Paper text:
Intermediate horseshoe bats (Rhinolophus affinis) are hosts of RaTG13, the second most phylogenetically related viruses to SARS-CoV-2. The virus-receptor interaction is a key factor in determining the tissue tropism and host range of CoVs, and receptor binding is critical for viral infection and transmission 14, 15.
There were four ACE2/RBD complexes in one asymmetric unit, and the resolution of the complex was determined at 3.3 Å. SARS-CoV-2 RBD bound to bACE2-Ra with an external subdomain composed of flexible loops between two β-sheets. The interaction surface was distributed into two patches. However, such hydrogen bonds did not exist in hACE2/SARS-CoV-2 RBD or bACE2-Rm/SARS-CoV-2 RBD complex, as the spatial distance between Y453 in the SARS-CoV-2 RBD and H34 in hACE2 (3.8 Å) or S34 in bACE2-Rm (4.2 Å) was too long to form hydrogen bonds. N31 of bACE2-Ra was also responsible for binding to SARS-CoV-2 RBD, however, it interacted with Q493 instead of E484 compared to K31 of hACE2 and bACE2-Rm. In the bACE2-Ra/SARS-CoV-2 RBD complex, both E35 in bACE2-Ra and E484 in the SARS-CoV-2 RBD are negatively charged amino acids that repel each other. Structure analysis indicated that in the bACE2-Ra/SARS-CoV-2 RBD complex, K353 of bACE2-Ra formed hydrogen bonds with G496, Q498 and G502 of the SARS-CoV-2 RBD.
Numbering used by the authors:
A (entry chain H): 334 to 528
B (entry chain G): 2 to 597
């Protein structure tokens, strides 16, 4: 009963930040040491739990969230941060207990001319709640004139496309993020470290 | 909701869409400049048309948001910049007439050639033909031919166009609620929004006027020293008390006196400081020049260069059958891509030029945090000033000694300082009257103070009073000698070079004070001073987000332009020029002319 940590990190396809994928890791033993020791990850910051003592703790379920953002947006994933990614795309709670892992993927997710297949949400009526996803494609009304389902004057499409090209700087390069969320409830724990 | 919140949404959509369209034009223009081809020209023109059409469309949409109702200071600047920059309110026919006049001027300037007498088909162009003659020749009649020929062939054709160019530009500026095209140009320095103390567009004229009165002593002594030295080279054509002939000032327009250094050198026997031969012997390559430049900015605490700069830039002439535009440039492509296009050569000139353009990239790297519209210098002079301030420290004898390029036993005499300071003053100081005069004439022409009937009269009346330069040949109103310069015929302001010189030495004094430099300002090296880089980084990161008055106060502790640092920089030369200008008339007579 070994945990399928290899599939979520070593995945050929990652999702957009507005449509972040969640995978339940359960009923297995998890080696957190081999993940944190890998120098392939540029970001490995754990909030609420010590990264070194991750292998000696037990939780009920583990949630792995996957998406792609820009380089300057890896800060917006952290708890208590605000921005178009945290407010309208992916929000982490203020009492977040888990780990955030990211690494540069310019060699894979960047193409000459632009990979416009990764996209994000620019505008929204209200800010997203913790661990919430919005897949709505309804036109946004910025002015008094009604949109009536047509893109136009003061009517902007909520979802706009990231533009990743190989010549961008590290800030504007694509970054793959994997967020491990830990849950402990009054139920038998299924995810534990090899002890 | 408020129109402020409604405007923030409009600028969010602009910044996102503009960054992609500007990146396409920047990547396309880079391909033409790094691979000249008729195909790449089409891609560059098409990508640039998409950016301009989107810019001009969103400029009209920005007018729908009233500026009075916006309370946040970033958005106000972006809406204000967008509304005023594009959307010509001029008529359909006039807008095309302006483009027809604007495009024609650049063609007459770029393709206008002057033919020699006695050889009607041996005709020379400004680059590199007429520039080499006007910068190297010591013959009166040769230079007068090139001077009048350029003035008559290129200038006379531009005269009827320039009269139509002024009225069309004034009508355009009057649409943006400005007085004239000069007022429209002076809005860069307008700290319009402040509690009180808002820097006025008219105040720039006042402060610049004050600067000329403060720099006149040093210029009048430099004018007298050049005069006495030029009389040895041109014996019977220069007056001991008259103005300086125009065609003998080292360039076609008298913009820079630096090429007069062989004729005005203070101490000839003292050796120069050229390290080019040492760099060749020491195996220096293109990588060493830019990497040692990276070390200098790293020493003050400024960030390392992006790795994309090291692999995506044209730091040398590629050869490889690719035709390139070999002109030093710093590229802010628009999405973290920072490159430098330079056909470098193992020379001291290119070594200093590398620091001047890397300084722009360090500026560009710092203000990338701000929105796209606010991603530029606070005013016109801030940008190039930063590049020259860094270039001043690397040319000091200590820096060349520490880099191993200069011998440890190089003689540092007062004789060597005067030679260096005169070469600097021939370029730095000599241009300031020429710059003040050129823009004063244009400003006054736009304001209507000079009729077309007296255009050339006031041009040379001001040339004689303000610059000390006299027309070699009488010029009718059929001429347009102001337009004979690139910046005038290509719709470019010239007051940048005035203000950048003031701010440059203001930065140099402040950073050298912070670096605890012991000695004169002209031997200062800010290297290894992390405190100086901290003050510099705070200025570069701000960009146009803050008023330039507040931005300047954070580094030099002054809200205004001050010539003190520039005059104090040249104080060793001022006291030397004053002892040697004994036995010599200092000043000029407006009435004397070589044609009389
Ligand atoms: C990712 O794949 C490499 C081999 O390509 C493997 O060595 C590594 O352990 C994998 N990591 C994870 C987290 O699956
Ligand atoms: Zn420059």
């Amino acid at each position: 009963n070994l945990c399928p940590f290899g599939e979520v990190f070593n995945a050929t396809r990652f999702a957009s930040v507005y449509a972040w994928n969640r995978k339940r890791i359960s009923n297995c033993v998890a080696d957190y040491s081999v993940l944190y020791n890998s120098a392939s990850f540029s970001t490995f910051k754990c909030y609420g739990v010590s990264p070194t003592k991750l292998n000696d703790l037990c939780f009920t379920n583990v949630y792995a969230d996957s998406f792609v953002i820009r380089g300057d947006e890896v800060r917006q994933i952290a708890p208590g941060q605000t921005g178009k990614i945290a407010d309208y795309n992916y929000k982490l709670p203020d009492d977040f207990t888990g780990c955030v892992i990211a690494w540069n993927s310019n060699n894979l997710d960047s193409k000459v001319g632009g990979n416009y297949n990764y996209l994000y949400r620019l505008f929204r009526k209200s800010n997203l709640k913790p661990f919430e996803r919005d897949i709505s494609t309804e036109i946004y009304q910025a002015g008094s004139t009604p949109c009536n389902g047509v893109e136009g004057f003061n009517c902007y499409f909520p979802l706009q496309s990231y533009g990743f090209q190989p010549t961008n700087g590290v800030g504007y390069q694509p970054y793959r993020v994997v967020v491990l969320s830990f849950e402990l409830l009054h139920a038998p724990a299924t995810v534990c470290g090899p002890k | 909701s408020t129109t402020e919140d409604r405007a923030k949404i409009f600028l969010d959509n602009f910044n996102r869409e503009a960054e992609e369209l500007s990146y396409q034009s920047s990547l396309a223009s880079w391909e033409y400049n790094t691979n000249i081809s008729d195909e790449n020209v089409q891609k560059m023109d098409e990508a640039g048309a998409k950016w301009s059409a989107f810019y001009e469309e969103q400029s009209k949409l920005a007018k729908n948001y009233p500026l009075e109702e916006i309370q946040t200071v970033p958005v106000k600047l972006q809406l204000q910049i967008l509304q005023q920059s594009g959307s010509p309110v001029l008529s359909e026919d006039k807008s095309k007439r302006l483009n027809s006049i604007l495009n024609a001027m650049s063609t007459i300037y770029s393709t206008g050639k002057v033919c020699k007498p006695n050889n009607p088909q041996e005709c020379f162009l400004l680059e590199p033909g007429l520039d080499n003659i006007m910068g190297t020749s010591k013959d009166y009649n040769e230079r007068l031919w090139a001077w009048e020929g350029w003035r008559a062939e290129v200038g006379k054709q531009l005269r009827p166009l320039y009269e139509e160019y002024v009225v069309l530009k004034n009508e355009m500026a009057r649409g943006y609620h400005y007085e004239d095209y000069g007022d429209y140009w002076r809005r860069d320095y307008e700290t319009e929004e402040s509690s009180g103390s808002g820097y006025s567009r008219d105040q720039l004229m006042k402060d610049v006027d004050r600067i000329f009165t403060e720099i006149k002593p040093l210029y009048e002594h430099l004018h007298a020293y050049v005069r006495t030295k030029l009389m040895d080279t041109y014996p019977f054509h220069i007056s001991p008390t008259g103005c300086l002939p125009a065609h003998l000032l080292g360039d076609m327009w008298g913009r820079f006196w630096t090429n007069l250094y062989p004729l005005t050198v203070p101490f000839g026997q003292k050796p120069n400081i050229d390290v080019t031969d040492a760099m060749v012997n020491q195996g220096w390559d293109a990588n060493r020049i830019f990497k040692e430049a990276e070390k200098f900015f790293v020493s003050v605490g400024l960030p390392n260069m992006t790795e994309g700069f090291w692999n995506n830039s044209m730091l040398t002439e590629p050869g490889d059958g690719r035709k390139v535009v070999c002109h030093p440039t710093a590229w802010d492509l628009g999405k973290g891509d920072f490159r430098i296009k330079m056909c470098t050569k193992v020379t001291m000139e290119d070594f200093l030029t590398a620091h001047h353009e890397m300084g722009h990239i360090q500026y560009d790297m710092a203000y990338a945090t701000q929105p796209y519209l606010l991603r530029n210098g606070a005013n016109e002079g801030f940008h190039e000033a930063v590049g020259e301030v860094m270039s001043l420290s690397v040319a000091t004898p200590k820096h060349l000694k520490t880099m191993g390029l200069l011998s440890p036993d190089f003689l540092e005499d007062n004789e060597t300082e005067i030679n260096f300071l005169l070469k600097q003053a021939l370029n730095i100081v000599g241009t300031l009257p020429f710059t003040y005069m050129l823009e004063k004439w244009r400003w006054m022409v736009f304001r209507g103070e000079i009729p077309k009937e007296e255009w050339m009269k006031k041009w040379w009346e001001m040339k004689r009073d303000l610059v000390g330069v006299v027309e070699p040949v009488p010029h009718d109103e059929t001429y347009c000698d102001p337009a004979s310069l690139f910046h005038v015929a290509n719709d470019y302001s010239f007051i940048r070079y005035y203000t950048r010189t003031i701010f440059e030495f203001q930065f140099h004094e402040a950073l050298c004070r912070i670096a605890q430099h012991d000695g004169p300002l002209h031997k200062c090296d800010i290297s290894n001073s992390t405190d100086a880089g901290k003050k510099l980084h705070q200025m570069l990161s701000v960009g146009k987000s803050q008023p330039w008055t507040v931005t300047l106060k954070d580094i030099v502790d002054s809200r205004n332009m001050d010539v003190g640092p520039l005059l104090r920089y040249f104080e060793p030369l001022y006291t030397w020029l004053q002892e040697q200008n004994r036995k010599s008339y200092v000043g000029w007579n407006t009435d004397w002319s070589p044609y009389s």
